[PDB]
């Protein structure tokens, strides 16, 4: 229920922006999509992610064969590579990205960056990743290995890097309880469109 308070964080930021159409690239089991589902602020929740298997477990776990005809109609779930141009990323008021970029080599990060800010370019993008510092104050073996997060300065330097290549200006937040010098656990960039 850790991750719990993270998405409800960037559920918050999105009605903070009254944001009413919302597309979450990456959406894994849905677990945004349900949270989103709860306020009725939102009008059209679309998830997309890479895994045909990982969508059919996201719509069993949403069971969106049994939500009412009203509900039915807010949610849309779709497969994309994202790394092309695919209209269905046009017409959102926010895009959410989280848990996606620390997994991309150098080509698919920046394929994603031009799908995100160039292709869907909403009014607001909202991007979470772990801050790999908070690992470093001292179970899985591949669940143990850190090193393809992103440090503080980073995801920041990233993060100023494309809000400058395309049109947003970014701030950045810090959810989690802060460890002293080691930060949160996670770190989130919130981007808009324009200078
Ligand atoms: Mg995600």
Redesign the pocket.
């Known amino acids: 229920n850790l991750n719990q308070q993270r998405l409800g964080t960037v559920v918050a930021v999105l009605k903070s922006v009254n944001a009413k159409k919302v597309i979450?690239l990456?959406?894994?089991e849905g677990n945004?999509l349900s949270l989103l589902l709860k306020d009725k602020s939102f009008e059209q929740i679309t998830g997309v992610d890479v895994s045909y298997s990982v969508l059919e477990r996201a719509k069993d776990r949403l069971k969106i064969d049994r939500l009412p005809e009203m509900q039915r109609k807010r949610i849309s779930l779709f497969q994309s590579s994202l790394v092309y141009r695919d209209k269905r990323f046009s017409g959102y008021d926010a895009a959410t990205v989280?848990?996606?970029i620390e997994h991309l080599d150098e080509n698919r990060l920046q394929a994603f960056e031009k799908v995100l800010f160039e292709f869907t370019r909403p009014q607001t993008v909202i991007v979470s990743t772990p801050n790999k510092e908070y690992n470093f104050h001292y179970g899985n073996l591949r669940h143990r290995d850190h090193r393809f997060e992103w440090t503080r300065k980073e995801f920041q330097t990233w993060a100023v890097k494309v809000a400058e290549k395309y049109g947003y200006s970014v701030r950045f937040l810090q959810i989690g309880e802060i460890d002293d010098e080691f930060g949160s656990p996670t770190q989130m960039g919130v981007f808009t469109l324009g200078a």
Do not use: K
Request: net charge negative; with cysteine.
């Open positions: 979450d990456g959406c894994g945004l989280i848990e996606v």
